[PDB]
């Protein structure tokens, strides 16, 4: 039995970090031999050397595209634009983060504007909270009224993805795996 990691990692079109794509995984043998280019593999709270021989209840695969400079923000207790207003890991996070450069796929000479990130947000984000709303932000006492003028801006800012840009600004495909152990009989067993 095979866990559907092939769809998760080798997806053709990923989603923006403000609306990150969550996939639930259960009732399959989870084998991490598949995770065998140049990528970053950081595991928090678990021993990465024996993920294959570790049997828990649910796997949550969350996929999103961010810049190279923002990869370090996908970690427990990190603060930044992505961490605060787009995607936050909890303090006690039992899981792993897998990020790999995707300049070949998510960049074009004209510039890629399909990816967006939330810049303006009043409050912080709770762990694994998804903010999808696109209402105009109020940065002053005057109403935005549904119009985007002075002190009232759209909360979603596009990324500028070009092949000629540096490594820090290049698009990085990030998949974070969250492992949940439940009192109910587990059904993800490598």
């Amino acid at each position, epitope marked *: 039995n095979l866990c559907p990691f092939d769809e998760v990692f080798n997806a053709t079109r990923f989603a923006s970090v403000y609306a990150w794509n969550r996939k639930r995984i259960s009732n399959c043998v989870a084998d991490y031999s598949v995770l065998y280019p140049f990528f970053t593999f950081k595991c928090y709270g678990v021993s990465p050397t024996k993920l294959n021989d570790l049997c828990f209840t649910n796997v949550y695969a969350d996929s999103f595209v961010i810049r190279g400079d923002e990869v370090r923000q996908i970690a427990p207790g990190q*603060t930044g634009n992505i961490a605060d207003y787009n995607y936050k890991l909890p303090d006690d996070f039992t899981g792993c983060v897998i990020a790999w450069n995707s300049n070949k796929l998510d960049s074009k000479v004209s510039g890629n504007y399909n990816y967006l990130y939330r810049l303006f947000r*009043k409050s912080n984000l709770k762990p694994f909270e998804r903010d999808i709303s696109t209402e105009i932000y109020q940065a002053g006492n005057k109403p935005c009224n549904g119009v985007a003028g002075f002190n009232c801006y759209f909360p979603l800012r596009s990324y*500028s993805f070009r092949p000629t840009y540096g490594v820090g*600004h290049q698009p990085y495909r990030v998949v974070v795996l969250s492992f949940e152990l439940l009192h109910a009989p587990a059904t993800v067993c490598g």
Partner: antibody
Amino acid sequence: DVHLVESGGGLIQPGGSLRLSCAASEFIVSANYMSWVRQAPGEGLQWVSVIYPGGSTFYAESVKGRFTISRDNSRNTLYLQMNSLRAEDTGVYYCARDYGDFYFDYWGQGTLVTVS
Amino acid sequence: EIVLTQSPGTLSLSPGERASLSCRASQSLSTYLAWYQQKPGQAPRLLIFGASSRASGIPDRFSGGGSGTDFTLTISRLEPEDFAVYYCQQYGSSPRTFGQGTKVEI
């Protein structure tokens, strides 16, 4: 009424503490990215600190652990508490509206802090 | 910290019609640079953001264009009010580093 007004600057013996206030009109400090930027006399600008709308704070490498940025939503003020002031902190400080964490759209009139 | 060097330290033009100020970065910024103008004894005023976009209230005489490491700010007709100091700031990385400043004279 887009004005930003700074106050609290003055002479301070080194190692002393001073608090800067930035009173804002038509800006909601709680809903905006606020920045402190300082200029040494006859020198270039140097960003000091930034506070996010969510509450996250970041500081320049020369001023962390001694400078603290804060906000009060009630009087719509931006505060900067600087402790253990060294002689290289002298200059004119500005409170600025940073559009996101990119650039300062608006600037206050600035106030002068002289360390002895 | 990306170091922003401005090639002319001072630039001395008559109040006619030409100006060019260049900002160079050690590593690429990718149109993440802003231009401010400081009149003497006054707070800096934002002119250009995103290396090619004007802000509110600055006239058509101010223009800017660049990408990668070399960025330029040009003034169409140099009216007497534009004789001040100009700064190039970056936002590509942390922190936001400024240039040394270029001062325009008559």
